[PDB]
């Protein structure tokens, strides 16, 4: 099973023509992030067969040079997000490594699908592309991962991400949940939650190799 087949099935099931037309207009008319060639970078770097972990995000970062198609990741020489800083602090406390690389392409290559639920945003306007169709698309992605894979870890940070438990078959997959790494919630259960080692313990228990969350 490959993403091309899944994407085709989704675009067959639902009519995305109005969404495609809107995004065409938006990219030619406004400043939309990430760069268009990166909208599906999570999928490009983590082929369907390689998925071991899914981490859900929100919409992309909306500042220059930040977003590049992976949830929570920023490019080098971009403003560094507080949630990512807290993810890295917990990683250092959990696994032990201090990451210096600001982007998460390492994690994607290891099999971590870094899936925003909304895949575009206008510059400087958080949530500007909410409710245009992306949530239908990314729900169907989540469901396809749950349906066609076995023994994947779904890491669901924050209540909105946790609503997606309805799309996940908990008899075949692991769910790790906690509050979100944002400063507004991190001190009430994200720090000390050890999601990275919990994910690896699960993967090892089902005969899979762990994620290398550290610098490569």
Describe what this molecule looks like in 3D.
It is classed as hydrolase. Keywords: Uracil-DNA glycosylase, hydrolase. It forms a monomeric assembly. This protein is α/β, with parallel strands linked by helices. It has one domain (1-216): Uracil-DNA Glycosylase, subunit E, CATH 3.40.470. 36% of the residues lie in helices and 11% in strands. It contains 8 helices and 6 strands. The strands form 2 sheets. It has a 4-stranded parallel beta sheet. α7 (159-162) links the parallel β5 (153-157) and β6 (174-178). α1 (3-13) packs across α6 (134-148). The protein is globular, with a radius of gyration of 17 Å. 36% of the residues are buried.
Please provide a brief summary of the model:
It comes from Staphylococcus aureus (strain MRSA252). It contains 8 helices and 6 strands.
């Amino acid at each position: 099973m490959e993403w091309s087949q899944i994407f085709h099935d989704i675009t067959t099931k639902h009519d995305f023509k109005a969404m495609h037309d809107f995004l065409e207009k938006e990219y030619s008319t406004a400043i939309v992030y990430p760069d268009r060639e990166n909208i599906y970078q999570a999928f490009d770097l983590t082929p369907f067969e390689n998925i071991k972990v899914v981490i859900l995000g929100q919409d992309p970062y909306h500042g220059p040079n930040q977003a590049h198609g992976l949830a929570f990741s920023v490019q080098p020489n971009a403003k560094f997000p507080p949630s990512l800083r807290n993810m890295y602090k917990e990683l250092a406390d959990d696994i032990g490594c201090v990451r210096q690389t600001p982007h998460l392409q390492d994690w994607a290559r290891e099999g971590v699908l870094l899936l925003n639920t909304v895949l575009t945003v206008r510059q400087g306007e958080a949530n500007s592309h909410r409710d245009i169709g992306w949530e239908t698309f990314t729900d169907e992605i989540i469901k396809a991962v749950s349906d066609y894979k076995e023994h994947v870890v779904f890491i669901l940070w924050g209540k909105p991400a946790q609503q997606k438990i309805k799309l996940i078959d908990t008899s075949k997959h692991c769910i790790i949940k906690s509050v979100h790494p944002s400063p507004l919630s991190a001190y009430r259960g994200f720090f000390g939650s050890k999601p990275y080692s919990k994910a690896n313990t699960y993967l090892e228990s089902v005969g899979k190799s762990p994620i290398n969350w550290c610098e490569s």
